Amino acid sequence: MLEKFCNSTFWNSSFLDSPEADLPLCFEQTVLVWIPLGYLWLLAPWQLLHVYKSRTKRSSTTKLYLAKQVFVGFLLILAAIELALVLTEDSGQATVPAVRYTNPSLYLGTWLLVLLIQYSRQWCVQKNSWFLSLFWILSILCGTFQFQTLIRTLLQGDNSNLAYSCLFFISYGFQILILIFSAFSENNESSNNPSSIASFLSSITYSWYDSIILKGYKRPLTLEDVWEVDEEMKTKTLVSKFETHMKRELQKARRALQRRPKSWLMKALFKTFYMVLLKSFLLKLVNDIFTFVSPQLLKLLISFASDRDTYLWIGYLCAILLFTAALIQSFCLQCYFQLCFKLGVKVRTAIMASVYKKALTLSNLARKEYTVGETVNLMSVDAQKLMDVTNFMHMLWSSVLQIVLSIFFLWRELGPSVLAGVGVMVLVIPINAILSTKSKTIQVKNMKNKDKRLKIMNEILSGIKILKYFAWEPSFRDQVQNLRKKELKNLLAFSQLQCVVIFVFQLTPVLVSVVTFSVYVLVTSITLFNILRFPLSMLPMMISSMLQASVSTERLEKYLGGDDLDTSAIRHDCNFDKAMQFSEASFTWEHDSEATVRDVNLDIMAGQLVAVIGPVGSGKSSLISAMLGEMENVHGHITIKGTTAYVPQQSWIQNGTIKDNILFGTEFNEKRYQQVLEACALLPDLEMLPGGDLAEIGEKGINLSGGQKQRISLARATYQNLDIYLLDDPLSAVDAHVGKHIFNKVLGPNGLLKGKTRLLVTHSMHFLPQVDEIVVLGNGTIVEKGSYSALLAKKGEFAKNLKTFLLVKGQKLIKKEFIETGKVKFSIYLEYLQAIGLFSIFFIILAFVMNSVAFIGSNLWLSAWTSDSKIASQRDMRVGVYGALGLAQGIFVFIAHFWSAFGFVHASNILHKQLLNNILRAPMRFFDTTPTGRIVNRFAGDISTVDDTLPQSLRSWITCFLGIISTLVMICMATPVFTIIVIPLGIIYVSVQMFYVSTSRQLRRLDSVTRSPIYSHFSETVSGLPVIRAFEHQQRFLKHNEVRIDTNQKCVFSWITSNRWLAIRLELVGNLTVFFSALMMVIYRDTLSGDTVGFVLSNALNITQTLNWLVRMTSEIETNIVAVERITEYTKVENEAPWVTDKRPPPDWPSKGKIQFNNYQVRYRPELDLVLRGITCDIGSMEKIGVVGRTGAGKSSLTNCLFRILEAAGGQIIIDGVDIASIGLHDLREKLTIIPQDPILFSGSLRMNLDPFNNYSDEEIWKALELAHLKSFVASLQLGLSHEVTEAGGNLSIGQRQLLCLGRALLRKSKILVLDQATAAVDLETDNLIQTTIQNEFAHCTVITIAHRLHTIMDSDKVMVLDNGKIIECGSPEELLQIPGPFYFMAKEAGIE
Ligand SMILES: Nc1ncnc2c1ncn2[C@@H]1O[C@H](COP(=O)(O)OP(=O)(O)OP(=O)(O)O)[C@@H](O)[C@H]1O
Ligand SMILES: Nc1ncnc2c1ncn2[C@@H]1O[C@H](COP(=O)(O)OP(=O)(O)OP(=O)(O)O)[C@@H](O)[C@H]1O
Ligand SMILES: CC(C)CCC[C@@H](C)[C@H]1CC[C@H]2[C@@H]3CC=C4C[C@@H](O)CC[C@]4(C)[C@H]3CC[C@]12C
Ligand SMILES: CC(C)CCC[C@@H](C)[C@H]1CC[C@H]2[C@@H]3CC=C4C[C@@H](O)CC[C@]4(C)[C@H]3CC[C@]12C
Ligand SMILES: CC(C)CCC[C@@H](C)[C@H]1CC[C@H]2[C@@H]3CC=C4C[C@@H](O)CC[C@]4(C)[C@H]3CC[C@]12C
Ligand SMILES: CC(C)CCC[C@@H](C)[C@H]1CC[C@H]2[C@@H]3CC=C4C[C@@H](O)CC[C@]4(C)[C@H]3CC[C@]12C
Ligand SMILES: CC(C)CCC[C@@H](C)[C@H]1CC[C@H]2[C@@H]3CC=C4C[C@@H](O)CC[C@]4(C)[C@H]3CC[C@]12C
Ligand SMILES: [Mg+2]
Ligand SMILES: [Mg+2]
Predict the structure, then answer these.
(1) Does the C-beta of 144 come closer than 6 Å to ligand 3?
(2) Which of 867, 940, 1139, 1179 is 20 to 30 A from 493, comparing alpha carbons?
(3) What domain count does the chain have?
C-alpha cells in the first residue's frame, strides 16, 4: 500500500513519455531515502564492534574533526527546526502526510549515529574510512534527482514549500561540504609512512605518493628518501607464520614416507595467505561484470543517434553512465592488481628468510650436496620465479568465465552455428598438452646447468691467487664456456616451443570466426570477437609462468625437506662430577661408513690442561668436532658440563674492524681488552697497521698474514671467557719467540686461563713437560694415556718419538658502490642491439610490418564486403577469403618470433662471454677491494634478467608502435584533418612519461645495489658454521639477515606503488577524453551524416588503449635496460699487464738459478706505504737458501713479488740477465713452481685437482703420489683417484691437503722452486721423510724455504733474516751461529743448539 501511504502514484508511464520527464516525488521521498539510510544502519553495529576491538588510545582534538562535528550538529539543528515547522503546520487542524512526519525523525536518528561514528573513529589510526565516504557519495547521488525535480517545480511555480525547498538546499549543501572536508587527512603527528594515514578518496587514487615523485624529478633519489614498510609487512611476522605452517605440513607429510617430503610447500603457502586470495577473487568478478556491461551501454548510445525522433536526456544519461562505469572499473582493476603484486612480494620475502634460517642447521651428509653457489641460486632465480606467478593466477579461471559469457551473446544473435566453435576449442587442448609436457623437462635441465655454472663460478672467485700463481685461467675459462653453451642450447628449444604456442594461440580465433559463418547452410559481432580475443592472447605468458613456477617450487620443496642433525648424544649435565666423560663413544663422519673415532673412553677433571698428539690423519680434529657434535652417533654418549670455546685449525675472520672481531658481540671493557691484546702479543703488529685497532680487515682476512689471523682468533677465544677451551694447534704459524710468549702468558701453568680446563692438540714436543696428562691417538683410538714422566718411563712409542726428535690514512678499504645518476646513455642501446645483429633486426621489422599491412588489408576487405556492396558466387568468394589473411598474419607473427629467438640467444651469449673474459683479467687490488657478493650478483641476477625479461618487453613494444602506425593510417585514410586531435593527446601522454621515468629508473638501481649485502652475508656465515654453533651465537646472526632483507623490501614496495600511480593517471586521462568526445557528438544530433558518429567513438577507444599500453611498455623497457647498463660497468675495469708481450724469452730461458734483486721496493696499494725497502741480495747457481723472520716481516711478500703480483715501485729484479718487467706475465708465472702458505683445493675429483690439463698418464701420477707419502691413504680409499673433494677441500685434513699440494708441485719438474711453510701441520716424522724426498729429488734446482722451524733451515748455503722489510744478516748458518746475533738467539730459543 505504498500509494495509500504517500497519497500519490507508484509509477506513471506517461510521466517520462514526454520530452520533459519528471519522476514522481513520493518515489524519491521513499526508495531514494531508504537505500542510503539502511546502508548506514545495517552496517553500523559491525563497525562499532570493530572499533571497540581496536580501542587503544585517544588522539588530539583535530580542528578538522571539531569543524566537521560542528557542521553535522548544525545540520541536525536544521532537521530539528524543520520538524518543528512541520509540527506547527500540522497543528493548524489539518491531516499531515505520513511521510512528512516520518522523514524528519529518520534524518534526526541518522545524524545522531553519524556523530557517534565520527567520534568513535577518533580512537582509530585512520580517521576517514570507506564507510562514511561511501555513505556521503550515495547520499549525494540519491539526492541529485530530488533537487532536480524540486528546483524545476519552483521555476514552474513559486506556490510551494519555499521554506522546505530552502532547507533542503542548505542540507544538500552541507552534504557536499562534508564530503569535501572528508578527503583531507591530517599528519596526525605521524612521521611514519603516509600509507596508514590516508583518506579513502586519497588512498584509492594514490595521491599520497606525489611527494616522492616530485622530489625524484627535482633531484636524484637516495636510499634515505624511501619510507619504511608497514608493521605487518616486516620480516618477523611472515617468518613466524610461515615457519609454523611449514613445520606442521612437513610433520604431517613425513609420516607418509614411513608407510613406503612428497608433496608440500603448496598447501602451506595457501594456508598462510588465504585472506589476500579472497579479496582479489571478489574484485575479479566485479571487474568482469563491469567489462561485460560497458559494451551494452556503448551499443545503446550508438543506437540512440540512429533515430532523430528520440528525446534529449538519453544521450547525456548514457554518457554519464559510461563515465561512472569506466571510473569504477579502473579503480577496481588497479586495486585488484596491487593486491596480487603485494602477495607476490610477501611470499618472496618469506621464502628467502626461511631458506636462510634453514641453512643454519643442515647435517654434514646433506650439506655436502648444496654448496654456497647452489644455495645462492635458490634464493635468487627460483624465489624470483615465484614472485612472478601471482599476477597470472586468477586470470586462469577468469579466462574461462569471459569465454563462456561471450559465447552466449553469439548464440543470442546467431544460433547453434557459433556453438560448433567449441569443437575447435576442444582441439586447442591436446596440442597445448603435448607442447607443455615436452617443454617442462627443458626447464629442469636448464636449472641444473645453471646450478653447475654458478657452483664453478663461486669457487673460481674464491681461489684467485692460486689461479694466478699457477696460470690456470684459460682452462677454467673454457670450462665455464662449455657449460654456458649447454645452457644456451637448452634455452633455445624452450624459446622455440614458446613461439609455437604463441602462434597456435594467435591463429585459433581467426579460424574459429571463419568457421562460425563458414556453414552458409545454417539459417558489434566483430567488436565482441575482438574483445573475446583479448583474454585469449596472453595465455602463453600464463603457461610459461606456471611451468617455471612449478619447477622452482619442486626444487625448493626438495631443498627445504633436508635432514637435520641429531643431538641426542651429547648430554649437557650441569651437575657433573668432573667436566668430560666418554663411555666407549664411536662416531662417523658419513652416514653409515667406517667409524672415524672408535672405542674412546677418557675423563678429565676441571682445571686440567691435557695435550692430544698423534700422526697425520689420526683423528684429533674429528674428536673435537664430535665433542661439538658435528658427526653422526653410532654407539655411546658424551657428557659435557659448562659452555665451550673453539679455535679452528683454519682461522675464520669476519668483515669489519679488529675490535669488532675481538669483541664478537660483547660489552666493551678496558681492564680486560688491553690485557687480552698484550698477552696474545698482538700489540707491536697493531701499532704498525695504518689504522691501528680500527683497521678494516676484509672478507676472509686477505689483508693479514697467517700468524696475525691465528693470534686474532686466539685473542677472541680468550676474551669471550667461556669455561671449556678446545684449542686445535694455535701455535703453528707463529715463530719460537711469539709461541713461547703466548704459552707462558695466556695458556699454561701461570696464565690467563689458569682455572679453566684446556684441551690442546699439538705437533711440537717443546711444551710437553709443562702439561698435566698426554694422550697419543692412533687410527682413531687411544693407544696410551699417561703423564709426561710416566710415558717416558714406559719406553713406549713416546720414547722412540722423543729420541728421533732429540678515517686517517687507510682505514676505509671497501669503497661504496657507485650508482649512475641521470639518464641511460645511448651507447648501451647501441652496444646491445649491435650484439643481437643489425641484419637480424631488419628481417624482423620487415616481417612485423607485413603482419600490420595484412591486418590493414583484411580490415579494408571487411569494410568492402559489408554494406552488401551497395545492394552468390561473389558472396561465396568474399566470405571465403578470410583464412588467407588469418594464416598470413599467423605465419608472419611466427617468423618474427622464431627469427627473434635465434637472435636474442646469440646476444646473451656474446654479452656473457665479454663480461667473463674481462673480469678474468683484473689485478689483485680489485679482487681484494670488492667482496664476492657484487661479482656474484652481477654474474647471476643481471644475466638471468637479460636472458628472461628484455626480449618479451622489446617484442611487445614493437607490436604496440606498429599498432598505432596501423590505426593512425586507417584513421587518416579519410578525414585528413582528424590527425590534429592526436597532437594534444601525444603531448599529454608524453608528459606523464617524462615525469615518472626519473623515479622508476632510480628505484630500480637502488634495488640492485641493496640486494648484494644479502649474498655477501650468506657467504661469510656458511664458512664459519662450527665457530657460530660452538659459541652459541646463532640468534644474533639472524637479525642482521632480517635487516638486510627489510632494506630491499623497502625499495621493492615503493617501486610497485609508482607503477600504480602512473596507471590510475593514464586510465583517468583516457576515461575523461573518451567521455568528452562522446558528449560533443550528442550535442550535434541534427548535423550527423549517415550516423557517422557511430565509428568516431569506436576509433577513440582503441587509440587511447594502445597509447596507454605504449606509455607503459616504454617505461618497462628503460627499467630493464638498466640491468644491461649495470652489467656493462664491469667490462671496462683496469687491466693487469699483458699476458704475452712482443718481447719473447727463448726456450729453457731459466737454464740456471741466478735471481739477483737490486734495491727492490714495493707497496701493496698506491694509498698505503712501502712494505719492502732496501732489498739487496743474490741467489747463487742451484743454491739452497732459507729465509726466516718474525711474523709480519714480509717473507711471503718477498716470495710473492717474484710472480709480478705487485708492480715494482723502484729498482729491478733479473733472472739470468733478463729483467722480469720486460716479459709477459704468462711468460714467467708458467716456468716457476710454488706451494702457497694456505692450501686451497678445487672441487671435482682428485685427478682434476692434481692436474687440470690431462697431460699425464696414471703411472706418473702414482709415482708422484708415492714420492709425497700418500700411497697408503689413496689406495685404502674405495675409489682409487676418482674420489670427490668438497668445496674448499673439506673432505680431507690439513696434513693430507699439504701432502697433496707437495705432490702437485712435484709434477711440473721446473727449475726454480720455492717453499712457503710446507710443513705447518705435519709431524716431524713425515716432515723428515718429505725433506729427504725434496733433497733427493730437487738436487738440480734452486729452492727457497720459508719455515719457522729451524730444523729444516739448518742445512742451507745462505740464511737470510728479515725484521721490517730490511735484510739484517746474511751468511752461512755456521757463521751465524758462531757470531752472537739474531740467528744465534733464535736458535737458542728454539733449543736446537
Ligand atoms: N669433513 C670431512 N668429511 C669426511 N671425511 C673427513 C672429513 N674430515 C676428515 N675426514 C676423514 O677423517 C680422517 C682424519 O681427519 P682428521 O682431520 O680428524 O685428522 P687429524 O689427524 O686431526 O688431521 P691433522 O693432523 O691434519 O689435523 C681424514 O683423513 C678423512 O679420511
Ligand atoms: N693483501 C694485503 N694487503 C695489504 N697489506 C697487506 C697484505 N698482505 C700483507 N699485508 C701487510 O704486510 C704485512 C706483512 O705480510 P706478509 O704476509 O708479507 O708477512 P710475513 O712475515 O711473510 O708473514 P708470515 O711470516 O706469517 O708468513 C702484514 O702484516 C700487513 O701489514
Ligand atoms: C547540483 C548538481 C549536481 C545538479 C546537476 C544537474 C543540474 C545541472 C541540472 C538538473 C536539472 C536542470 C534544470 C532543468 C530544467 C530547467 C528549465 C529550463 O528552462 C532552464 C534550465 C533548467 C533550469 C535546468 C538547469 C540545469 C539543471 C539544474
Ligand atoms: C545520475 C547522476 C550521476 C546524474 C544525474 C543527472 C540528471 C539529473 C540530468 C542529466 C541530464 C539532464 C536532462 C538534460 C536535458 C533535459 C531536457 C530539458 O528540456 C528538460 C530537462 C532535461 C530532461 C534534463 C533533466 C536532468 C537530467 C536528466
Ligand atoms: C550533472 C554533472 C555531474 C554532469 C554535467 C551534465 C551536463 C553535460 C548536462 C546537465 C544539464 C544539461 C542541460 C539541461 C538542459 C538543456 C536544455 C535543452 O534545451 C538543451 C540541452 C541542455 C542545455 C542540457 C545540456 C547538457 C547539460 C548541461
Ligand atoms: C625486435 C626488436 C629487437 C627490434 C628492435 C627495436 C628497437 C628499434 C627499439 C626497441 C626499444 C626501443 C627503445 C625503447 C625506449 C627508448 C627510450 C627513449 O627515451 C628513447 C628511445 C628508446 C631508446 C627506444 C629506441 C628504439 C628501440 C631500441
Ligand atoms: C590527469 C592530469 C592531472 C595529468 C596532468 C599531468 C601533470 C601532473 C604534469 C603535466 C605537465 C607537468 C609539469 C611540466 C613542467 C613543470 C615545470 C618544472 O619546473 C616543475 C614541474 C612542472 C610544473 C610539471 C609538474 C607536473 C605536470 C603539471
Ligand atoms: Mg687437525
Ligand atoms: Mg706467510
Answers:
(1) yes
(2) 940
(3) 4
From 842, 1117, 1121, mutation site for ligand 6 pocket: most ligand atoms within 8 A of C-beta: 1117
1177: left (phi over 0), alpha (psi -120 to 50) or beta: beta
Take atom 22 of ligand 3 and give the residue whose Cα is closest. 152
Joined grid coordinates for residue 826? 645511448
Q: How far apart are CA 617 and CA 1068, in angstroms?
A: 76
Q: Which residues are annotated as a binding site?
A: 614-621, 1189-1196
Q: Indicate the annotated binding residues for ATP.
A: 614-621, 1189-1196
Atom 6 of ligand 1, nearest CA residue? 1291
Ligand nearest to the CA of 962: 6
Q: Which of 685-701 are b and which e, b meaning 16 or more Cβ less than 10 Å from the residue's Cβ?
A: beeebbbeeebbbbbbb
Residues 577 and 680 in one domain: yes
Cα(585) to ligand 4 centroid in Å equals 95
Of residues 1282, 918, 834, 1016, the one with CA closest to residue 379 = 1016
Enter the resolution in angstroms: 3.4
Alpha carbon 1160 to its chain's center: 47
What residue numbers bound the domain in which 1252 lies?
Answer: 1233-1309
Domain termination residue (choose one: 741, 763, 785): 763
Atom of ligand 6 nearest to the CA of 829: 28
Q: Are 509 and 536 in contact (CB under 8 A)?
A: yes
Report whether 411 contacts 367 (CB < 8 A): no
**Of 1138, 1125, 712, 1134, the residue nearest 927 (C-alpha):** 1134
Experimental method: cryo-EM
Ligand (nearest to CA of 707)? 2
Separation of alpha carbons 47 and 54, rounded Å = 11
For ligand 7, residues with CB inside 6 Å are 991-992, 995, 1065, 1068-1069
Instruction: Kindly state whether residues 1251 and 1318 are assigned to the same domain.
Output: no
Q: Is 1070 in the pocket of ligand 2 (CB under 6 A)?
A: no
Distance 1101 CA to ligand 4 centre (A): 25
Nearest ligand 6 atom, CA 841? 4
Q: Which of 619, 637, 505 is nearest to 582 (CA)?
A: 637
* Grid coordinates given for 544: 610459461
1150 lines ligand 2 (CB under 6 A): no
CB distance 1214 to 1220 below 8 Å:
yes
Based on the fold, state whether residues 1224 and 1295 are members of the same structural domain: no
Same domain, 732 and 748: yes
SS in 3 state form for 1278-1300? CCCCCCECCHHHCCCCHHHHHHH
CA angle 1033, 1037, 1042 (to 5 degrees): 150
Look up residue 980 and give its DSSP letter.
G
Of ligand 4's listed atoms, the one at least distance from the Cα of 152 is: 21
Atom 21, ligand 5: which residue's CA is nearest? 312
Phi (first) and psi of residue 987, to 5 degrees: -65, -45
Phi, psi of 514 (to 5 degrees): -65, -50
Report d(CA 1322, CA 1334) in Å as an integer.
15
Crossing angle (nearest 10°) for helices 162-183 and 130-156:
150
Tell me whether residue 781 is in a domain.
no
3-state secondary structure of 1135: coil
Q: How many residues can be counted in the chain? A: 1393
Collect residues with CB below 5 Å from ion ligand 9.
1196, 1237
Phi-psi region of 264 (alpha: psi -120 to 50; beta: other; left: phi over 0): beta
Q: Where are the alpha helices (DSSP H) in 974-1092?
A: 982-1010, 1012-1022, 1025-1030, 1036-1083
Instruction: Identify whether the C-beta of residue 901 lies closer than 8 Å to the C-beta of residue 496.
Output: yes
CA of 1125 to the centre of ligand 3 (A): 59
Which helix (H) or strand (E) segment holds residue 339: the answer is helix 313-358
**For residue 964, which of 1104, 1114, 1115 has the smallest C-alpha distance?**
1104
d(C-alpha 622, C-alpha 596), whole Å? 7
